């Protein structure tokens, strides 16, 4: 997901502005739904929410707009258990053997005969939480096992937290309300207000360990691989208690990253670090935020946001609707050089022509070059030291860049990867005249609607994930609820769409109406004031009671 908040120092009108571009499933329990909620005099908020929740999750009100992105902070820890050498159902804490608890659950299963039978299953639990097995990595043998402590199991504040956000007046109020309750489970929050403040908060529920405990409490080999794993045989590796935290064992709000500025803040699912490069966020716990290389979506955003030129609503909208495949910027120039260097190779001819003609986009009319580029990048990602300029922490926005074609071993492997990618594309059932929109679709009844965008891993800001189904790529997730909010004098102006439409039901008048609009990238007013609502010639009203 992407989020951009612009403040008074950079906005065209000197006020706040927010782009919300969550990338979430197109079906199921996380399918966004638009609604506007009003209790006259004390609540007036509009946005979109996940199924079953009577609050607005991403939205705006009279003076405020906010959104969320999945963060890089840990929201659980694994605990490696040292098993009792005499009994693999017992584990050691400070050298003392403790029994595992056994909780049985019973499930009814409908069989082939249509009758129900009862299945009983035993869940083993430690003082930390339930045991988990990843065969071949996190096993349960006679020496060790792994338990999982989820910090959000004790977060009973989640709904109150969003309802409180729904009642927030401005950025300062929003910050107070989130830091006070600490009910946000696993997302960043970004916001802008009418006065022109731009806010980023990495304010969620995160296991807390005091700094001095981390060196000895971490499992070195697992933390190196990005798993929050701790030593479960030492009581001193329990999550630390701090009276200032809203929940025992979680990180106090003062210790989590916050950036409050008047130019911009952004996030595309990387850590807090480069939210705004002019002011890096550093020195946090490894469970909270680390200085890891940013992904190409953030790199794309920063290439467009940095500088002195004012940002207008149109600028932020077009960062989505351009469908620019930003990963091409690092790779395609040198790849085309390699192509020109190998004009004798008939195995490369079709691929190289397609890449040369490609508009570097994931637009509906983008050529098969995007497909060739995707299959090449999947292989390029697996090559060792093929970057001309590797990632440089002192140039975190401009590296990695280019192919190290001057190394003979790289040139060979890169050509082979292109040869292999071309063979794969040609083995598939795609005519070379077909364009991206001919391939990527969302099915609605018996028909298909062409969908622009591409995988976020290729640096397409309008991230769309698809899977092969039948003869097409079926969209499964990505750009979902779009909201672009500014604050002109009359009241908040919100523009956007719900890409997959309000209703998941094929019978509904609102099953595919916004999907047709998403396909054509035609965003619409999100009416909020009574004047806007009353101006809508489709306005319908129903009052209900019981």
């Amino acid at each position: 997901s992407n989020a951009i908040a612009v403040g008074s120092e950079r906005s065209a009108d000197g006020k706040g502005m927010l782009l919300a571009n969550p990338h979430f499933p197109w079906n199921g329990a996380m399918r966004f739904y638009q609604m506007h909620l009003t209790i006259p005099g004390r609540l007036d908020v509009m946005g979109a929410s996940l199924p079953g929740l009577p609050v607005v999750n991403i939205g705006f009100s009279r003076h405020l707009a906010w959104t969320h992105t999945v963060d890089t902070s840990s929201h659980f820890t694994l605990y490696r258990l040292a098993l009792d050498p005499k009994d693999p159902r017992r584990y050691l804490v400070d050298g003392r053997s403790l029994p595992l608890e056994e909780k049985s659950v019973a499930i009814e299963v409908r069989g082939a005969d249509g009758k129900l039978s009862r299945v009983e299953h035993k869940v083993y639990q430690s003082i930390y939480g339930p045991l988990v097995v990843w065969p071949g990595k996190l096993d349960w043998n006679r020496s060790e096992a792994y338990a999982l402590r989820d910090a959000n199991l004790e977060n009973t504040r989640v709904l109150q937290q969003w309802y409180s956000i729904n009642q927030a007046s401005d950025v300062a109020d929003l910050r107070r309300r989130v830091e006070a309750l600490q009910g946000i489970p696993w997302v960043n929050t970004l916001a802008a207000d009418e006065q022109g403040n731009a806010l980023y908060m990495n304010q969620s529920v995160v296991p807390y360990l005091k700094p001095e405990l981390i060196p000895a409490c971490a499992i070195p080999q697992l933390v190196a691989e990005g798993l929050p794993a701790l030593q479960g045989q030492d009581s001193r590796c329990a999550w630390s208690r701090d009276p200032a935290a809203a929940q025992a064992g979680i990180t106090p709000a003062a210790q989590l990253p916050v950036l409050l500025r008047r130019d911009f803040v952004q996030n595309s699912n990387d850590s807090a670090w480069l939210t705004n490069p002019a002011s890096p966020l550093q020195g946090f716990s490894p469970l909270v935020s680390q200085e890891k290389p940013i992904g190409p979506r953030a790199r794309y955003a920063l290439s467009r946001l940095q500088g002195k030129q004012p940002l207008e609503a149109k600028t932020l909208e077009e960062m989505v609707t351009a469908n620019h495949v930003f990963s091409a910027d690092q790779v395609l120039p040198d790849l085309l050089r390699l192509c020109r260097d190998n004009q004798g190779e008939k195995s490369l001819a079709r691929a190289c022509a397609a890449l040369a003609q490609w508009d570097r986009g994931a637009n509906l009319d983008s050529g098969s070059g995007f497909v060739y580029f995707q299959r090449f990048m999947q292989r390029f990602a697996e090559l060792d030291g093929a970057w001309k300029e590797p990632f440089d922490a002192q140039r975190p926005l401009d590296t990695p860049q280019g192919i190290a074609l001057d190394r003979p071993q790289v040139a060979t492997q890169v050509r082979q990867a292109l040869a292999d990618a071309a063979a794969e594309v040609e083995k598939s059932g795609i005519p070379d005249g077909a364009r991206w929109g001919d391939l990527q679709v969302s099915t609605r009844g018996q028909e298909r609607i062409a969908i622009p965008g591409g995988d976020g891993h290729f640096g397409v800001y309008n991230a769309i994930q698809s899977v092969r189904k039948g003869d097409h790529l079926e969209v499964v997730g990505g750009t979902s609820y779009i909201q672009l909010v500014t604050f002109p004098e009359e009241g908040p102006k919100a523009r956007g769409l719900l890409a997959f439409s309000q209703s998941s039901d094929p019978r509904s008048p609102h099953y595919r109406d916004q999907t047709e609009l998403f396909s054509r990238q035609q965003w619409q007013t999100l009416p909020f004031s009574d004047r806007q609502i009353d101006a809508d010639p489709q306005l319908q009203r129903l009052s209900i009671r019981e």
Binding site: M35, H36, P40, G52, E108, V123, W140, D150, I544, E546
Partner: protein, 164 residues
């Protein structure tokens, strides 16, 4: 009772719910959401109740693409009655009222539904919901950044046998 909402829909079926209190507000939300998505919510509640195998057998999957039986074991473990009760007890009066209203409004739509916008009319799993069902959904979402990612791993965790 004490449930009342005014709902306006603009283009594309976006609801604008007005009410004097949280119960009424939830009433409007549950009703409007059901009009568009009753079947979706019914299915996800089945999932969160750990009842997929009961309605659909062992061969199917949830919308998170977990096998029905492991999914059920996970949600039966997650959404035990004691866990739901403690979660409810910790809720403010405003949130309880939002949830009570929502369940009532969703159920109102179900009573009235004739299939106009509901493709799963007549399915045994399309049924009146309770506030506990909304707690089940909430807790399912709550753990997506945690133990929910390890649902299969939790189900797979069994002590060693006599092996070498």
């Amino acid at each position: 009772t004490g449930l009342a909402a005014d709902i306006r829909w603009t283009a594309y079926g976006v609801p604008h719910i007005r009410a004097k209190d949280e119960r009424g507000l939830g009433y409007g939300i549950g009703y409007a959401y059901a009009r568009d998505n009753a079947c979706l919510l019914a299915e996800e509640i089945v999932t969160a109740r750990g009842e997929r195998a009961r309605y659909f057998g062992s061969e199917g999957k949830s919308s998170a693409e977990l096998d029905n039986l492991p999914s059920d074991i996970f949600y039966a473990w997650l959404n035990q009655p004691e866990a739901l009760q403690a979660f409810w007890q910790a809720q403010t009066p405003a949130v309880r009222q939002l949830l009570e209203g929502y369940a009532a409004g969703f159920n109102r739509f179900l009573r009235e539904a004739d299939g106009k916008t509901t493709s799963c009319l007549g399915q045994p799993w399309l049924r009146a919901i309770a506030t506990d069902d909304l707690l089940r959904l909430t807790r399912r979402l709550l753990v997506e950044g945690g133990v929910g990612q390890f649902a299969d791993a939790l189900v797979a965790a069994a002590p060693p046998g006599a092996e070498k």
